[PDB]
Amino acid sequence: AGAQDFVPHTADLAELAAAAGECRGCGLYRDATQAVFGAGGRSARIMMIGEQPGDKEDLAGLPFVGPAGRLLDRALEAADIDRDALYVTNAVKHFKFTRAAGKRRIGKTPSRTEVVACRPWLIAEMTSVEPDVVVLLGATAAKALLGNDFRVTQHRGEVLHVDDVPGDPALVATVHPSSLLRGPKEERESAFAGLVDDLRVAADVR
Ligand code: SF4
C-alpha cells in the first residue's frame, strides 16, 4: 500500500532520499516540485517529525528552512540541542498546497490516507537512524505514529512508548512550530517555552 513498493531495501539515507524522488505512493508528487526527505545522519539520537514540507522547503529541497524552521532552531538553542544529534523529517514528503487568491503557496493538511501512504518512508528513516527519541511536531506527525485519535494538547511533553513502533524509541508529542508564528506575543512566549520544555524532555531521554 502507498509508498511501500517505492521504498528500496537499504538503510542508506542518500539512497532512500533518491528513491523518494521517484515515489508515486499518493497523488502529492504531481504538483510538488520534488520530494523533501529528512536531513541529518544515521548517528542521530533525536528524530524530529513535522507535518510536511512547506513552500520554501519544497523549493529548497530541505526540511525546516522557513520561518517555522528558524523558530524551531531558536527552541533547540534554548533546549541545549546539538544539531549534530538531530535527524529531522516530515510525515509526508511532498508539499500539498493551493494558491491563495490575493499568489503565495498555502499548505493544505495531508489526509489520513496520505499520511498512511507516506508512512513507509518514516518507518524506513526510523529503521535507518535508530533514534533514542522521536519528537512529533504537531497533530499530523503525532497521529501518524500514535493513532488518528491522539490529542497532542492532552499529552504534550509526556514520554510515550508504543509497542508497534520500530525500535521502541521514546516518543514526545509537541506543538507544530508554525502555530507559534501567530497570536498574542505573551501566548507565543509561553508556547515557545513549552516547546523548549518538550525538547528538553526528549534530550534528557536515556
Ligand atoms: S507524499 Fe509521500 S507517499 Fe505521497 S508521493 Fe510523496 S513521497 Fe510518495
Side-chain angles (χ1 to χ4, degrees), residues 1-3 5-8 10-14 16-73 75-83 85-102 104-153 155-180 183-184 189-203 205:
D5 203 53
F6 295 98
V7 179
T10 184
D12 189 288
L13 290 176
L16 287 172
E22 313 274 41
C23 190
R24 310 184 309 279
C26 71
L28 292 181
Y29 79 92
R30 287 191 301 254
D31 295 357
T33 304
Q34 62 196 319
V36 176
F37 213 70
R42 302 179 52 186
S43 70
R45 158 174 121 254
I46 309 166
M47 175 171 292
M48 301 199 302
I49 307 172
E51 176 171 280
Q52 62 173 317
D55 177 33
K56 314 290 207 201
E57 287 68 29
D58 172 74
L59 286 157
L62 297 159
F64 289 105
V65 280
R70 282 188 259 293
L71 190 153
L72 182 57
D73 186 74
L76 298 164
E77 187 80 37
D80 323 304
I81 309 183
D82 184 1
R83 244 200 181 248
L86 285 186
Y87 185 83
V88 193
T89 192
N90 288 292
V92 312
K93 305 302 206 251
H94 271 112
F95 183 37
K96 184 187 186 172
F97 69 96
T98 198
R99 279 265 183 210
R104 336 271 247 270
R105 290 181 317 156
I106 302 298
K108 275 166 55 93
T109 312
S111 72
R112 179 61 177 185
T113 309
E114 290 152 346
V115 175
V116 169
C118 208
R119 188 167 51 206
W121 293 119
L122 215 53
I123 298 302
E125 288 171 296
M126 282 191 53
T127 284
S128 169
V129 175
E130 296 184 356
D132 293 334
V133 59
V134 182
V135 175
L136 303 163
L137 298 167
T140 296
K143 285 187 301 197
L145 295 180
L146 293 171
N148 200 46
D149 60 290
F150 176 79
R151 303 301 189 87
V152 167
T153 50
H155 301 287
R156 45 169 317 188
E158 297 172 6
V159 180
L160 307 180
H161 267 96
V162 303
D163 57 9
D164 50 85
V165 147
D168 202 26
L171 312 160
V172 178
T174 189
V175 71
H176 204 211
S178 295
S179 84
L180 263 53
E189 280 154 1
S190 186
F192 179 83
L195 176 57
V196 169
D197 285 341
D198 297 350
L199 296 184
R200 284 174 180 185
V201 171
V205 160

